[model samples]
Target chain A: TYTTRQIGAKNTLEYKVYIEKDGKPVSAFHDIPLYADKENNIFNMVVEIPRWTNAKLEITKEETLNPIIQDTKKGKLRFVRNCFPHHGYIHNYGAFPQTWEDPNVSHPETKAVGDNDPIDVLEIGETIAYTGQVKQVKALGIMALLDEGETDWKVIAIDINDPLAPKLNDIEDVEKYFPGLLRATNEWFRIYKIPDGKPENQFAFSGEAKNKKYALDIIKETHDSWKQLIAGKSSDSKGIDLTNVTLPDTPTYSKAASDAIPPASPKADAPIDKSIDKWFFI
Target chain B: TYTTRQIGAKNTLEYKVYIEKDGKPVSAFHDIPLYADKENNIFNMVVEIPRWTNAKLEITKEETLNPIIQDTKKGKLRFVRNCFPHHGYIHNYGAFPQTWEDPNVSHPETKAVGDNDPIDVLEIGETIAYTGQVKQVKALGIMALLDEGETDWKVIAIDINDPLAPKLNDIEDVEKYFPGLLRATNEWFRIYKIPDGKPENQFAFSGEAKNKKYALDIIKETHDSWKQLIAGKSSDSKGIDLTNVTLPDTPTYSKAASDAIPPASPKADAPIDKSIDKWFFI
Candidate 1:
């Protein structure tokens, strides 16, 4: 299991979660392996923003070690709106490690370029997953989101240890076991940005949910993109930091720079905004 | 009373509704007066797409005489989705004539340019209005919609003859008499385009429903914009035909052009798509 150290002041833009293994700081984006069990088709998922939380937390692609941080807009911290019948986020939202969606590459099907971030995942297991928690998850399906005219694919998965994991092996099983979830998930993503004064995010495929095979293919494609990114062969790196303690063969590896990183802050978190709990029945 | 003339086949992009008064053709967008009773603050609303309908009917800005027509996407007729709890539109959906949102001028608060169409209206009366019904309505409130980064204001009103009209004099009264109607209206606009694979429409003032005074102010502003449009003083005409039977002093007015418009087609409407009636619980 991977561990996380809280850095900077909580509830502020500076708040971030740095990853560590064996008491040594590591680059969460580059060090973690994509597959947890290649034989069983289970992949490692790094949870950033847990279910029902409003804070817009994600892996900072441009930051050193790619620590998880709260996103800010116009100098203010962002939070997802609680669209009625569902709170903040309906599932454990995160991204796959060692996988990048290359901004320069346009998807053949979506006809849009990538969002220049890690491929996102939605872990729909029963229990809530914590920020920075690394869990092996089984891919069930995929949904193509055209966010601001960019291809932002969301993979639907289930935690291997989840109670219903045995029954939900495929995308069809998700409908049979948890009816209306796929549609609700689509609706949530479609309207989540409306409250933020932005247009609703568009989707490809007429917002249809594709099966596990399609999702696996996308994951493989994104993994290949990450390989080119680490090898400095991608058309655009977008200034993403590639420093890593592991992967010495790569040109970005640096032990001295990793040692220069500061320790985690011991200060307690600032109080979250009470308005985050407020729900809109729309 | 105003009557509608169907000028094309239904269920196809060619379908259109031309307006007539006392056996003479008129521009639904340019000829009709904005105010029904200027002293009483009542506006004349031209109903295009009525309640419980899926067809995206709007007054054509570019066409001669400005006939109401069904919007099309890639040669196919467009239909609004039946977001659950509401079948089609929750109220009589239409627009106010002689009022335009100037695309060149950006609002001070929203900082977004106009949608270059007539100001839209939502008649919350108890009765279902027809395709060309001209109803006098009292403006109760207004919601600022930021659609595709354009300012599209939706004025919420009620028919003067409606039984509940007397009780809903202000935006606050809408909450008291109709309960969750305001929030639901905001939600409807926000998510209506999602089913069409488009992103949610955003709003200004954090999606708040403004009072009657504010609504009237917007109506006045849009009316001023329309005056500029008719006078050919606006920055961008956007190819919107200003032809009219009335307003003869304007350069676009021509009695011969009005007489040249084809009469209503005698054929009945084609069967609407069965999918329009399908309700999505999400």
Candidate 2:
């Protein structure tokens, strides 16, 4: 099991999640394996933003160990729009560990290049996952989001421990068990950015959710891309820090350097904005 | 019973619904009574657009007899965006006759002024009502939409003949039978215009669906406003034609003029653009 230490002041741009395992620091983006149980199709999901929260937390590619941090725009911390019925995110949103969507590579089906980020995952379990929580989830489906002309694929999954997980083995089963959830997820991603003055995000496949086999294929492709990235063979890895404590023969890997990273001390969490709790009807 | 006659070319701005009652011409916007059964709180709804279709058809306040016509933007007939999970519209959409949202009158609850159009109605029935179909619906709830700052209230109703109507007596009943429908309705209205290059629409009461009593009160208020409009006591009725065939003591009412209005002959409906059938995933 992995653990998270809160770094810096919460609710601020400086707030981050420093990950650890077995009393040692590890790169949440690099050291963590993509598959927690590959034989059973279970994946290691690095939870960045929990369900029903507004802060736009994401795994930082540029930071050492790639700690999860709140995203910002125009120097201020960013928060997603509360598209009603959904307070913040409708599901536990995060990304697959040791996975990358290479910007240079184009998806043949979507006919769009990648967004240069790790593959996004939407855990539809009942539980609200905390920041830096390494969750083992089963892939059920995949949605191709054409965000600003880029292919930002969103994998739909559920935690194995969830009460509904056993029944949801495929995309069709997800709709059968949780009616309107897939539709709500699609609607949420489409208009969530519009409140921030951005245009409505488009999608591929006419917005149809693909089955588990298709989703596994996409995940495998992304895992291969991550291997290329860490091997320094990727076409574009300019800002991404490849630093790790476990991975052998990587240029940035060093035990002494990893030890130099300080552990987090207990500090009072920053007060969240009252406006974050306020709901918008639309 | 009332019927509609097709006027002008179909699929064009000139295409309109010319209403008739007892073999005589009448104003679809003005001549039709608001109540189908006032004691039972049933309303007469003028169906302008059906489910799963696109064409922004509306009652023309400036035209004689107030015929329903397709709305236009920059000389092109307007079609609403197809927000997914919903194809065109999730419900049988139309307006309540003899009910006008007075632009000058400020709503006490919403605090925003009216949208200057007839109060809109969304019939949440299983049946797909055709354009110009006069449906008798029971008011279940009201949603306050702040369209570009104007208070545009959307009444949620159900066709009296619908299979689900008997079970749905109030707003809460809607959710009980058709779960996630209210949430989808709110989401639909909020992001529907974003694809038209317009910003997301705002809503009042934090997007809450007010109860049946509250909806009835709003309908009553709009009916009174329509009375003032027909009486020529409205502060802003500059472009609104007061011509009517049924209403007595109105300055524009004339039996001879009403008779002069031509009856329609069947013509092939102009082909609807195939592009309208294309689904948008987002």
Candidate 3:
């Protein structure tokens, strides 16, 4: 038998040791960063994504009298960084745990009514802002706007041909292929902008064209797929649940078996591997 | 100082309470019965009544919410006896400090709606049909009924007429006359078949009517009066709230007051006046 006092987001190993501990966090807790970096100001972008992502976790659903809706963004990420952390395979570390807050607020509408309404419709250019601050060019690349239906920007969101949203069954098909949408979105953004670096001095990796499209591509594809389901035109006639979907969990295309881990070998010309010194210097 | 909790049906002394003491009995409690006395059943009677000579009190409205609309009622009476121990009062000699035990099934609606709804409404007549068979028929009286809207033979309720119900200006008048109505109803029902001496039987006393309508007339009247105000009408155009009504405090007609020491007698009942007893009861 073991004794304990207070525990902060204990890792996967501890979770394994205490499996009976509910999916609901115990006295143990983790506060992961919602955005990749405060400097990047990714709060707006993160909020734009539906929180429903967490509602469809692959793990057993958390049943609770009082929900501890842990924003994965606020949880540990050891496992979230790469499915099944090699060291601690139980739970993830902080959302940025430089990164893993995964749950998204699955708000399909403006208020409680709109989000849960049986029928929902959105038009092209009809940018429906939810909630958050405006994104600036210097802060983060992709800015999310609040869809107050308030703006001088004339949007033609009117796609009268829009079909009704599908139920949970229809989402299963898409989710199988896009299981990594949430993970990929955060992972790519982290690598593109910070690559094994501290949040400060983020400007060092500024103006990377490849990373912009990379991040945007992930976002666009992820959003488009979910939008298609909302529009009820997607061939993906799976469950409404993403976790139930098979593979190809990419936003644009089906997911490829885990993207090859970036090369880790030190270059021959390297002096004492700057990568190793990064932890100390940063 | 001692502290206690209470809930009133019409914002008056009409309510139900359950009491349990650790040690010692308290004498100030009402003697509400838990069941009718089987050996003393009398044939139910019928009498001709004028159109307006309905029951003394009536419910004006009801709303449902958690427990329901969180609605209220109104009506008239001479005396209101809370069935159980409430804030200022308790029922019977052995009753005092008590605790709340949720009825089995522990519904959320019951919690939200609270004690206003009668126990019989939820349990149906079945629970009461069980024979505890000890408490006197007088103690079985508890104000526990509200419209279940499920029963067929519910009391022919005398409720507010949408347009004709009392108004604000009438509050002072209703408050002035309602208590008399309550006393008359309870005293009348308890003794209509017996002597006019309502002072004789403990069951016939207003204080002993407990949960019966015989005791709830004025309290119901008050509820109906308030219900109308919520609908933008007041009893007789006079604002009427028990704590704030404008009526000069008048007493309800009850033998309890008759039991009070007569000024001329100097001593209460003057040792029951053996000669007077001979004149009245010998």
Best by lDDT: 1
Sorted on DockQ, highest at the top, how do the candidates line up?
A: 2, 1, 3
Instruction: Supply fnat for every model shown.
Output: 0.00, 0.03, 0.00
What tens-digit string does per-residue lDDT give for candidate 1 at A30-137? Answer: 888899999889899999987767889888888888888899888889888766555578788999999988899789879999988889999987666788888999
lDDT of 3 by residue, B148-195 (tens): 211111111111221212331222332232323323333322332122
Give one digit per residue, the lDDT tens place, for model 2 in A1-282.
588877787678768787888766788998888888878988889999877678899999988888888999989888886554455776789999888888997789888888888999999776667888998999999999988888999999999988778888999998777677788878887888877788888789889999999999998898888888889897687899888988887788877755766778646667776555433444
Assess every candidate by TM-score: 0.52, 0.53, 0.17
Q: Where in model 3 is the C-alpha error above 4 Å? A: A1-220, A223-282, B1-282
lDDT of 2 at A232: 89
Q: Write the per-residue lDDT of candidate 1 for residues B81-181, one digit (tens) a residue.
A: 77754546767899999898889887897999998889999997656687878899999999999997899999999999887788889999878766677
The candidate, 1 or 2, that scores higher on DockQ is: 2
lDDT of 2 by residue, B1-282 (tens): 788888777787667787778767788888889988989988899999986567888888898888888999998988986555555676779999888888886888778888888999998775567888888999999999988788899999999987678898999998887677788888889888877888889888999999999999899999999899898889887688888978887777766656777778646678776456432444
Could you tell me which 10 consecutive residues in candidate 1 chain B have the lowest summed lDDT? B273-282
lDDT of 3 at A159: 14
| Top candidate when judged by DockQ against the true structure | 2
Please identify which of the two predictions, 1 or 2, would achieve the higher TM-score against the true structure: 2
Question: What TM-score does chain A reach in every model?
Answer: 0.96, 0.96, 0.21
| lDDT at residue A157 of model 2 (Cα atoms) | 95
